[PDB]
Subunit: 191 residues, 6 copies
Amino acid sequence: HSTAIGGVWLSVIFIFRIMVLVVAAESVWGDEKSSFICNTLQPGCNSVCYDQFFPISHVRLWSLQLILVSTPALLVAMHVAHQQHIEKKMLRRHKVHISGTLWWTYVISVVFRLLFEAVFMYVFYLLYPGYAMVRLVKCDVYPCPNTVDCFVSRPTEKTVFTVFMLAASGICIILNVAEVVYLIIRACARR
Amino acid sequence: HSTAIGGVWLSVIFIFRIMVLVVAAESVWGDEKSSFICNTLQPGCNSVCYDQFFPISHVRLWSLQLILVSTPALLVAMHVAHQQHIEKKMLRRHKVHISGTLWWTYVISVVFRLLFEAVFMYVFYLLYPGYAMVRLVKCDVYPCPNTVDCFVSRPTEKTVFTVFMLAASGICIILNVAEVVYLIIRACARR
Amino acid sequence: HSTAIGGVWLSVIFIFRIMVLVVAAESVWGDEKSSFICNTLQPGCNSVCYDQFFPISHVRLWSLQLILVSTPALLVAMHVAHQQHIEKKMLRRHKVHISGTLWWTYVISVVFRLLFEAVFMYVFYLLYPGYAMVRLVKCDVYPCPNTVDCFVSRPTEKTVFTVFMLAASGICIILNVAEVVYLIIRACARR
Amino acid sequence: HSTAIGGVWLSVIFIFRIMVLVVAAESVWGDEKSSFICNTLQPGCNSVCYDQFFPISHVRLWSLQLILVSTPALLVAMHVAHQQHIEKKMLRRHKVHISGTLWWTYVISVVFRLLFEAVFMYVFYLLYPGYAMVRLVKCDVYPCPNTVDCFVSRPTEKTVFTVFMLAASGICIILNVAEVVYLIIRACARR
Amino acid sequence: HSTAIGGVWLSVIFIFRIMVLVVAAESVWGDEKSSFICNTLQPGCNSVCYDQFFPISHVRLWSLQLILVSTPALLVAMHVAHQQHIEKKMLRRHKVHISGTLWWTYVISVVFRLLFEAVFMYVFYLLYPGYAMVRLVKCDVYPCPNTVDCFVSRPTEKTVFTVFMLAASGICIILNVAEVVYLIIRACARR
Amino acid sequence: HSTAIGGVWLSVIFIFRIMVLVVAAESVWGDEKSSFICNTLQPGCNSVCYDQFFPISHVRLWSLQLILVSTPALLVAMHVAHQQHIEKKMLRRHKVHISGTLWWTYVISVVFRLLFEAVFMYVFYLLYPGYAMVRLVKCDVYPCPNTVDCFVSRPTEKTVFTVFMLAASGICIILNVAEVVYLIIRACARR
């Protein structure tokens, strides 16, 4: 069974996040490294400064988050497909038990999706505290001499897309919590 | 139900906007940053000047507008698909109530699409007042010394595509308003 | 209904134009701006000279022309699909009236396609009078000092593809006129 | 009807030519202009020399030849599809006449394909007499001073692919001639 | 027959590995060679240093591992499809023998997949002992004079993706071992 | 009819070769020319040296070999499809004759595939005797003065992929020979 409160909004928002990531990664974040430049004559300063200030790109983090969020759905879909194959073999009490075992698996999958979203949000907070990208950064990593100034490619557009993605992720978290609560309420109402 | 006055023209114009954006983004706006050049020896001036004068690219704004306009249609489609799944479960008074609840949802979706289009048009006006791109821009953002001249890649072609997109968006707004009015008239004629 | 004189040749020639544009845009016109070079030390001269001599690329104009020519077909197809949906609703005098109203819509769509093709041909004539691209151009746009010489990337190949596209467009115009005349003759023969 | 002598071999060889062109154009001919270099300090010499020695690229000529060869097949397919639509309308003496009119159209399409292949082969001979690309070319086109030496990107690989394409085209011409002769023989044997 | 313990988790984890590799190879490892730079004026030092420190790219090794792991599944699928074709020919004792022969083939395919995964993990350990990429490397390969410092493009992101892939591969190995043990237990329980 | 000994292994190994070539060509061999560099100030030395040492790229040779190996299968498939069309026309002694004529065609196709594979292997041996790519090459082709040193992009990775492809091709040759022998044995056993 499915609930219109949680499933439809989750699917549409997840599709929206996919479309936003597809738009952003190809064009906005494409030249994140090539356009990265520092005011220095020291060879190798640009690469080490980019690695220091961008350990992992925003689009890569978003793609990993989307994949990890998607994995429970793939797992439950494959499991139900195998169960229906077993049912088709049987055709060529127990069914109630199968449906019962299916129920908790879906609940656990929803909980795991919520946990994955929260973990990725916390990782994003740890790696990039400020939601807004800055135009100039100060670099002191070896072999850059003293401190040099480096310039990010597209701070404002990246900030806008970051705000969009963060708002979508937060709405997803809230909707997952609400869906879990509504599932609990429905289970209580059954009894 | 559907109305030939609003639905068909909306769909064809939305497809036309998709095709125009696909044509424009790949070629016209591809070198918007790489070809951006300023008359200065100061490192980092090009990137900061591009960020100042182009906080978000036109094609990215158009893609976001198209996605946001599309989201209500995806929501209503998913909701009706879930409702038909519930109907198929029932098969294996109330229907009139379901259709009634469906009606206002579609009306609200149309209103939300109109609001999204208007909001994106206003955002475009705020960010880029002039409809026509200019060949030369004056830059005074740090660390550019005093004021430097910078040159846009394809001002005229970008202006032409901007005019096309703006005309399409305005026609979409007018058609949405007309469709809402015609829906009100039809509802009144029913009673 | 359809006529073999106009519909089949129109469709095959339109597909041929699509294939030719796909071949040309990817390779021939890809480096139209990057390979554009002027004999000067003035920064920004290349971009302003390219914008002056190429306000809009040939491939972009051809793509816009193809899209605008295609839009009436999409409109009529969506409208007939909606009408067949209404017919299926009816199944679950008037039909002759529906077919009659369908007839003039198709005629007007053909006329609009012819007008669009003629308008795009006239625009091409206005923007690029000479059918053949030239190897060297003279530039005096600010900030280029005095007059400088600039060199086009692939004049001869672009000329060949321009001749192909122009011949196809002219044949399309002639075939549209002939189809309109034959439709008039058939309508007269009916009475 | 179809003949195994001509149709199957023609289709498989045409598919082989498509695959060979797809392999060649993406990689072999991709850097034909960017890697083109001349031993001179004169700006604009590279572009004019490339245009002089390569008026149209080999891959573009092959693609145009394939498209033009394909067009008669598309025309006859669309025409027979329209005729079958007319037959389906009739269902909801004359048929023998329709088949007879179909026969000469297919024969003329085959003749046109043969003529197109021969014309493209002659054009290739006129533009590039030598089948083998040369490593060094001598350039005297304005504004190149006196005569300069220019270097082609991949002479040997381009020569190999040119030999492959030319052999395929010649085999296609021979097979088309043989198919026409066999059609004449079969028509005579019918009487 | 299939087991839910091994098959579903294996398939979902293999799909997850495909998605992770698709995300990583296009963007993270794209500029692995172009961005590779060494602090020297000696021509050819960059290429030889990259070849010495990166004999084969991580993404290429992962793709080869995925292909080799996939090959047994393709082999068994093609073999069962041929067997079902033979069964369909028969339709137009022995079946038990066919199923028995099928069983050991699937077991051997699982064992081969486990061996391939272990071999690729050992190869990865041999080529890249440290799981984490380093920012700076020391090069002494001819013709680089003495020892030069070279800088890797994206050490931290590559390290993160390497950890992800290694964890997925190890989980796959453990799951394959568990599936083999469970198959042995089920075979014993049958007797 | 089909044989499980030859057909299934041939198909799976051919698919494996396709996947390996797809992995290799896009990334490994992409910068084979752009990254090619020689220690000289002579313009044009890089291009002529690359042409001398790499007359045709490894990936292009592998793609041509795969296409040529595939062509007999396409020919026999098209021929049997035409024969089944003739059979369907007949439906709307002789069949045994058709099957007999089909048999030798498939045998000849297998022999031609084996010959093509052997010929391409011999061509690879002639063009590149050493299986392993070398880091440094010595160039004396005009206009390079005296002898210069040039550096290959990715010698080790290219060597690994070359070994993979050569092993696959040799296994294909052996399997083709074995399939021919088994076909002869089966034909003898029939009598």
